[PDB]
Subunit: 200 residues, 4 copies
């Protein structure tokens, strides 16, 4: 099946004033769309190389699958772990199980957020900040992935895109304000489901 761009589960302006409509449109229709197109071409290229038994080609195309495939995976998860304040955005208590696990690990929900913010701001270059679990209702950990590498060896609970294109038009260089503002639109209900499922 040819991969396609998953529609957003809300209007492009539903996350304002935390994430502008302009960013949402470009981020989804341009960047994410590009990763989808790139993934399709890459797999097609890998397919031909495999059929031709061209090892050099198969290995070279590997980076493309990883970059575009990881981009597709990451953004698909990103769109879903966000929501407007009217649809549960920022409603941490709509995730009782995950919230209880978070407080046990970091002491409190707010302490967890400061640690997460710190991690996002510590990412050098393009990357993502993630809250992950080692299984259904498992132990929680904060991790980061570079460029468009996806979370592996664990199940993603929620992610925050730290590529500059995810916030520059609005927050400019002030990524600290983007990080602190995105908390208002985190779809915790979706995070609750991912944590309980603990599906890597």
């Amino acid at each position: 099946q040819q991969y396609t761009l998953p529609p957003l589960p809300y209007p492009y302006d539903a996350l304002q004033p935390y994430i502008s409509q302009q960013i949402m449109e470009l981020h989804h229709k341009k960047h994410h769309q590009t990763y989808v197109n790139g993934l399709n071409a890459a797999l097609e290229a890998q397919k031909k190389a495999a059929e031709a038994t061209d090892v050099p080609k198969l290995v070279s195309v590997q980076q493309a699958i990883k970059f575009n495939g990881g981009g597709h995976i990451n953004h698909s998860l990103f769109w879903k772990n966000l929501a407007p304040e009217k649809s549960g955005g920022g409603k941490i208590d709509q995730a009782p199980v995950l919230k209880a696990a978070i407080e046990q690990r970091w002491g409190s929900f707010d302490k967890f957020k400061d640690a997460f913010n710190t991690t996002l701001l510590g990412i050098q270059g393009s990357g993502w900040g993630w809250l992950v679990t080692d299984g259904p209702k498992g132990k929680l950990d904060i991790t980061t992935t570079h460029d468009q590498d996806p979370v592996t060896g664990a199940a993603p609970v929620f992610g925050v895109d730290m590529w500059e294109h995810a916030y520059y038009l609005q927050y400019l260089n002030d990524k600290a304000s983007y990080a602190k503002g995105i908390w208002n639109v985190i779809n915790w209900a979706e995070a609750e489901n991912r944590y309980i499922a603990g599906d890597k």
Copy 2:
């Protein structure tokens, strides 16, 4: 202590190819940050060394590389850029380098194609560079990721492909960015670096 080097031209001197807004942020915010992070990083490696704390010494390594590289790349960037009415985009002001580029790629135009292709090929944050292996040596196009600086070769000129270098003006259209920056490339500076070939 390291400091932020002033730009060699007004913040709007590169328009309409690079907006005044980007230059101010890119210089006063981004480059400044690498400068601050570098000083703070070297400070740590110092005390860490005098304390015989290898774990801490190695831990600061990344910060020194990221911020130090950040300081190096941007400092070179500002200098290999120039307004049109001041030599910007004037390839003929680099006789020796131009000739070498024509010999390597067949023509200046073919070199540009190769460079643009390379710039647009960068995944994530990085830089595109033209380098030489020595004074008036062999030319090559390379890239570095994040803020890693060119090593093992002498930088002739670089183009910042980090999103913050063009997003405000070109948005996601990095192709238009690569296309437009050729108009403000300071070839006179590239020429000096090439002839000097200072690794």
Copy 3:
């Protein structure tokens, strides 16, 4: 203070037949010594470059500091988390607190060993396998570092060197038998102290 090669806490053949005298001698007197020499040379070059306010040189030397500094750290810890069978080597009961924590995290000591061996055998190229903790008697985790990168952002409990020079003379390509045999000389007494201390 110039860095020097730390003496082994036991004879060169005290670890046989799990690790030959020959390997220990070369691994210690040669490999580790090389990192020590490289570490001193790197820090000296970094100092001169710093004094000369030479950013390029400062940046370039970081790889040597990282590589050699890491090598010194990793092997220094390695010699200490190993011990003759008659001196507590392979005696997990000498690590009551650690063993308990290990049993709670992985269910049992054997299950932990399986997970560790799997991680060790999964390393591509040169690297290390580690059991770390986030703090004194904190949460345990299995991780790996590539080449000579040291454990950072966590406290090392014990590590296993998977570079080929650590086993090739005796096990040749059979790194699986090397992984299995080393558990016999693991100094759990040392791992206990490191875990209880939990010093990052």
Copy 4:
């Protein structure tokens, strides 16, 4: 279905520069392992692609890179080696390449010293390569980490610097290994690759 290519000479034909024991293990064990690894990774890749499993598709990309790169590298390696009687070390059997090397490094011997230095400078597992940008093009010495294959250039000849390539015979003395392998470099083959200049 990928298979292990036979050697173009007996297992002891490269002595005393590379022992028979090394050749047998390196070829029959190590190289074979990458072949098997490549075959398995490719099958897992096809199954994931047909199941629309992007996460699984991305994950196996590293195995294709590592094993496929290992297969490519070793296959190139056996062919750019040869017994003294079969053209081993006969640099003048590569007129064009040699002229290019002398023009670049001043002399063939200066080239060898620079290459040895690059080889000894490799950190961890890796390879040393002499490459060209195209047919009878510009020469350059580079290195690749672990089993990464040469990309963006055409491999003229490579020297394996993984410890398994020399430890049994040279132990930690990689310098003597580098200096001895020049005697068995198949320059006739190098000449052909340089003239062809086929990237990959």
